Amino acid sequence: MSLLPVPYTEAASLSTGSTVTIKGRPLVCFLNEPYLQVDFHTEMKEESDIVFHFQVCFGRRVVMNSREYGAWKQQVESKNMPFQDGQEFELSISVLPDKYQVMVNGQSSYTFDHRIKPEAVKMVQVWRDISLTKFNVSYLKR
Amino acid sequence: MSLLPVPYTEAASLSTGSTVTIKGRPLVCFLNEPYLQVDFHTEMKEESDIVFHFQVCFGRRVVMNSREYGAWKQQVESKNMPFQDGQEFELSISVLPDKYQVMVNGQSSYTFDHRIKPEAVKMVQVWRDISLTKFNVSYLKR
Numbered sequence: 001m002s003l004l005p006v007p008y009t010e011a012a013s014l015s016t017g018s019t020v021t022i023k024g025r026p027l028v029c030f031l032n033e034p035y036l037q038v039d040f041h042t043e044m045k046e047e048s049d050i051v052f053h054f055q056v057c058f059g060r061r062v063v064m065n066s067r068e069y070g071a072w073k074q075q076v077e078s079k080n081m082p083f084q085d086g087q088e089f090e091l092s093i094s095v096l097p098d099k100y101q102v103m104v105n106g107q108s109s110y111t112f113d114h115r116i117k118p119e120a121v122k123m124v125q126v127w128r129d130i131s132l133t134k135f136n137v138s139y140l141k142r
Numbered sequence: 143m144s145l146l147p148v149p150y151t152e153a154a155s156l157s158t159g160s161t162v163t164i165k166g167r168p169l170v171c172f173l174n175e176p177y178l179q180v181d182f183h184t185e186m187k188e189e190s191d192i193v194f195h196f197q198v199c200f201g202r203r204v205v206m207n208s209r210e211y212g213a214w215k216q217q218v219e220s221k222n223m224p225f226q227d228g229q230e231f232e233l234s235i236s237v238l239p240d241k242y243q244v245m246v247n248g249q250s251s252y253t254f255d256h257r258i259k260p261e262a263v264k265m266v267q268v269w270r271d272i273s274l275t276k277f278n279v280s281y282l283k284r
């Protein structure tokens with residue numbers, strides 16, 4: 001169905017029990033090393049701080065970090081690569097009490113402990129070398 | 143004027159005296175590290191070999207390489223960064239006898255010696271985190 005704009009920006013609120021659901025596909029083959037980035041921002045401004053930075057180099061690695069008062073903190077690097085060459089992916093990011101949990105196509109794949117309270121989030125941006133068909137933030141919980 | 147599709151693909155031929163002219167802008171601020179990539183390919187297929195790979199991490203560095211029978215060769219890394227935060231750029235890549243020369247906004251900025259004859263080029267792709275308003279390959283010379 002219909003392609004969403006990329007870069008994709010949605011005003012957002014997160015707390016324990018929130019889920020962020022993303023369906024998309026890499027624009028090109030893994031040999032060409034397309035990226036995916038998901039940033040949970042503290043303001044609508046793109047230069048604002050990032051509570052949770054998630055950056056996939058498809059076929060190679062994933063880095064997670066925070067950007068706090070304009071400065072990148074301690075990088076976490078994973079070689080875990082559940083994404084499949086040439087395939088649509090479904091990404092879901094759950095806000096648990098102590099961490100973000102990243103599911104890829106239904107499989108727990110990455111976690112990242114909260115450095116800043118999730119309530120600081122005001123915006124989610126999804127960008128780099130993908131098409132997007134679906135984006136949702138859940139708002140069911142108190 | 144009118145935005146070209148990104149990723150941008152044009153069938154191309156190059157030889158000594160050819161110029162490739164690119165006008166675009168980074169989609170986001172340099173703090174968010176948008177990329178630009180220009181690949182001179184040996185076939186229309188995106189998985190084909192790359193005679194000249196040019197990859198800008200805006201505000202940080204540039205890497206140049208070739209991908210030959212599916213394998214990346216010796217990386218050349220530059221910290222030269224003439225690109226200006228938030229600005230439109232004009233990139234021109236001249237095919238000289240012994241190298242590619244990269245001009246940024248009229249300023250000689252990078253060169254890369256031919257590893258494969260430029261006549262092997264059949265396609266140029268321009269992609270990653272930019273908008274494009276202009277792309278030209280010159281065809282004036284014998």
Ligand SMILES: OC[C@H]1O[C@@H](O)[C@@H](O)[C@@H](O)[C@@H]1O
Pocket residue numbers: 063064065072073074075175
């Ligand atoms: O300069 C190093 C920093 O650069 C940024 O682009 C992110 O990749 C961070 O994860 C990293 O710590």
Ligand SMILES: OC[C@H]1O[C@@H](O)[C@@H](O)[C@@H](O)[C@@H]1O
Pocket residue numbers: 033205206207214215216217
């Ligand atoms: O694996 C290392 C290689 O990876 C590719 O993505 C390019 O960046 C090459 O310049 C580099 O040599």
